[PDB]
Every structure is written in C-alpha cells, then in structure tokens.
C-alpha cells in the first residue's frame, strides 16, 4: 500500500498538478472534522467580500 500511494503521488508531483485528494473532500465527514478552519475561512472570505 506504500508502493501504490507513493507511485500515484509520485505522478502528481511530476505532472505538476496539486490540490487535495478528490475522493476525500467529496464526502461530508471532511467538513465536519474540519469545522474549525471553515468558520475562520468563511468569515475571512465574506468580510473581504469574495463569497
């Protein structure tokens, strides 16, 4: 499992792509365990007027 997870990740860096894992952030428990940073970032984007 370390040979596969460090091969696709070895392709993502060499291709130049970046970002989160698409299949991790697609569910709803990600935005419930990261409840702290979203209340910061929503206020930061809304108060600056970009939301």
């Amino acid at each position: 499992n370390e040979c596969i997870a460090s091969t696709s990740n070895a392709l993502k860096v060499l291709s130049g792509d970046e970002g989160y894992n698409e299949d991790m952030v697609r569910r709803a428990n990600f935005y419930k365990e990261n409840e702290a940073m979203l209340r910061e970032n929503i206020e930061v984007i809304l108060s600056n007027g970009r939301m």
Binding site: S47, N48, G49, R50
Partner: protein
C-alpha cells in the same frame, strides 16, 4: 421611575451595527481560474442509447 427617564451618560452613541470593509494585502487570496459549472450535467444521450 420609568426607564429612559433615568439619567444617562452623555456619550457618542453606539456604532456597533456598522459595516466594515477590510484592506487585505496583495498575496492573501489566490488566483482563481476555471469558473465552476452550477448547472447539472445532462445524461439524455446515455439513457437514450
């Protein structure tokens, strides 16, 4: 004695419910491309075939 007839402080009135904008620096927000598609994708051809 009825309230608002009690003696109150002579002060500048409250500015609590005021709307403020923010001076954010240059590199704070990322550059954004790829406008997201709000509209749902249609699958008429797949279910037609």
């Amino acid at each position: 004695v009825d309230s608002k007839l009690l003696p109150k402080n002579i002060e500048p009135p409250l500015t609590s419910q005021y709307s403020t904008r923010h001076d954010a620096p240059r590199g704070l927000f990322p550059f954004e491309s790829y406008k997201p598609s709000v509209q749902l994708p249609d699958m008429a051809k797949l279910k037609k075939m």
